[PDB]
């Protein structure tokens, strides 16, 4: 049966997928493309004209940022057994976009434009880097409370990026155990093989070989602090999920 | 039943798709996104998580640069009735990549790198802009002589970009008639609505509104002329198709 690592952009997809690959391998992940080989990102596969079997006989582990209800996922409607929904603080996601885009905390003008768009969209809708991901609460709802709407046979386990970072081997095991990949023995090594350090080192090594690759809001202006806080404590599905996963 | 405008990159996809949209509309195409709306490019749809119905009841016209055998197209195996295979001189395709990449005919160093890669790949395999398109003869074979391998019920009509450019209303009609979209009356207007001139004007107008958008080898070095001519007159499937569609 079919499994998904679902995650809204910048939630820590690459890291969790890398850990799950080294765990399954029992070996560190030598090159970046090892992530796409270990837990294929569906968007990646589609770009090449791949499209994994609907109704596989053995367990297949895939990843995506799509909401569960995108038409392309319908082929997996009945075969989807499990979902791991990786979630991260929306504040940090928004800062993460600023970093990956090379914007320093001194181009306030340009940062304000990102945070205002993110606040109005309740996510990344206007960022062209990604498609079909919806807003942040739309994404989570679709993979959690309304998952049966898209995948009637699915069980779901949420995991917060912040709990993964605080206790990597404990939370990884929850995931490994839920996905039924094996014993807790190999979990320690998987964590050690994929630290922030080992990750950057491996990404740089790959970029150089030619291979394919890739805080607070106060510094911004108090009126973006209030605009965020309004959204964070308001009555939308955004606020719902922020409270539910302890981000208020 | 399902139809395809298949075409290797730079073959004139946008232009033929634009003409087919204005023909079907009976009106000019006001904005660039009108092309994707009129004859959706499958890669485009997949990027958003769309995936058109397998086995539609009425005629659906889609476009792609994928070879016919990409796994993602299997969903349309049985429902595919027709293919229009748009083909262009491989020499011009290679020059076209140079233009769209903003390389002047005076950065010979950089041009040589493109032509040498294109010659060795027999197409665009190494250009990251596109994926799943295969080499030039692989692409054509898959949509023509071996089409039944991927789409057992399909009839195919080839059209050369060069014949479209020499006689636009005559060759467009061949396409319109083969796809059974209606009478020859509207063909004249479709051609006039989508000239190189009207096209650039519409693309610039769109870019400005904010909307989403996008000779010879002698000048290069005689040893690339000979490298191309060797390939063009050699014994590979490349040479086969170059002779067959009058590019030798």
Short mmCIF file of C-alpha atoms in Angstrom, two decimals, chain A residues 148-242:
data_model
loop_
_atom_site.label_atom_id
_atom_site.label_comp_id
_atom_site.label_asym_id
_atom_site.label_seq_id
_atom_site.Cartn_x
_atom_site.Cartn_y
_atom_site.Cartn_z
CA UNK A 148 -10.78 10.55 4.07
CA UNK A 149 -12.29 12.89 1.50
CA UNK A 150 -9.24 12.19 -0.73
CA UNK A 151 -7.96 8.87 0.67
CA UNK A 152 -10.87 6.93 2.32
CA UNK A 153 -8.60 4.15 3.66
CA UNK A 154 -5.86 6.34 5.17
CA UNK A 155 -4.56 6.59 8.71
CA UNK A 156 -2.59 9.76 9.51
CA UNK A 157 0.20 10.75 11.92
CA UNK A 158 1.21 14.38 12.40
CA UNK A 159 4.76 15.34 13.32
CA UNK A 160 5.98 18.86 14.07
CA UNK A 161 9.35 20.01 12.79
CA UNK A 162 9.93 21.57 16.28
CA UNK A 163 9.50 18.18 18.03
CA UNK A 164 11.79 16.54 15.47
CA UNK A 165 14.44 19.18 16.23
CA UNK A 166 14.05 18.94 20.04
CA UNK A 167 14.14 15.11 20.15
CA UNK A 168 15.22 13.70 16.74
CA UNK A 169 15.60 10.00 17.61
CA UNK A 170 12.37 9.92 19.67
CA UNK A 171 10.16 11.54 17.05
CA UNK A 172 11.82 9.75 14.10
CA UNK A 173 10.97 6.44 15.78
CA UNK A 174 7.30 7.48 16.04
CA UNK A 175 7.45 7.90 12.24
CA UNK A 176 9.50 4.75 11.55
CA UNK A 177 7.19 2.71 13.80
CA UNK A 178 3.99 4.17 12.30
CA UNK A 179 5.25 3.47 8.76
CA UNK A 180 6.34 -0.02 9.99
CA UNK A 181 9.83 0.09 8.50
CA UNK A 182 11.45 -1.93 11.30
CA UNK A 183 13.05 -1.79 14.75
CA UNK A 184 14.18 1.20 16.78
CA UNK A 185 17.85 0.08 16.59
CA UNK A 186 18.74 1.93 13.36
CA UNK A 187 17.05 5.21 14.37
CA UNK A 188 20.07 6.61 16.24
CA UNK A 189 22.32 6.22 13.15
CA UNK A 190 19.75 7.77 10.82
CA UNK A 191 19.63 10.87 13.06
CA UNK A 192 23.45 11.15 13.26
CA UNK A 193 23.79 10.62 9.49
CA UNK A 194 21.50 13.61 8.76
CA UNK A 195 22.30 16.51 11.11
CA UNK A 196 22.20 20.12 9.84
CA UNK A 197 26.03 19.83 9.62
CA UNK A 198 26.19 16.53 7.68
CA UNK A 199 23.39 17.82 5.47
CA UNK A 200 25.08 21.08 4.37
CA UNK A 201 28.37 19.23 3.84
CA UNK A 202 26.62 16.66 1.65
CA UNK A 203 24.70 19.37 -0.30
CA UNK A 204 27.89 21.33 -0.99
CA UNK A 205 29.79 18.18 -1.97
CA UNK A 206 26.97 17.40 -4.46
CA UNK A 207 26.72 20.90 -5.93
CA UNK A 208 30.47 20.79 -6.49
CA UNK A 209 30.37 17.39 -8.20
CA UNK A 210 27.94 18.95 -10.68
CA UNK A 211 24.92 17.01 -9.36
CA UNK A 212 21.43 18.65 -9.12
CA UNK A 213 20.57 20.39 -5.82
CA UNK A 214 17.94 22.37 -3.76
CA UNK A 215 14.11 34.03 14.86
CA UNK A 216 11.32 36.65 14.97
CA UNK A 217 9.33 39.08 12.83
CA UNK A 218 10.15 42.05 15.13
CA UNK A 219 13.14 43.24 13.02
CA UNK A 220 10.56 43.99 10.30
CA UNK A 221 8.24 46.67 11.66
CA UNK A 222 5.74 46.12 14.53
CA UNK A 223 2.85 46.65 12.08
CA UNK A 224 3.78 43.30 10.54
CA UNK A 225 4.04 41.87 14.06
CA UNK A 226 0.46 43.04 14.66
CA UNK A 227 -0.72 41.88 11.23
CA UNK A 228 0.69 38.40 11.97
CA UNK A 229 -0.64 38.33 15.55
CA UNK A 230 -4.09 39.36 14.28
CA UNK A 231 -4.03 36.41 11.88
CA UNK A 232 -2.50 34.09 14.49
CA UNK A 233 -5.23 34.90 17.05
CA UNK A 234 -8.15 35.50 14.65
CA UNK A 235 -11.03 33.20 13.68
CA UNK A 236 -9.73 31.56 10.44
CA UNK A 237 -8.62 27.93 9.81
CA UNK A 238 -5.07 29.34 9.97
CA UNK A 239 -5.53 30.28 13.65
CA UNK A 240 -7.23 26.91 14.26
CA UNK A 241 -4.17 24.95 13.18
CA UNK A 242 -1.67 27.32 14.82
#
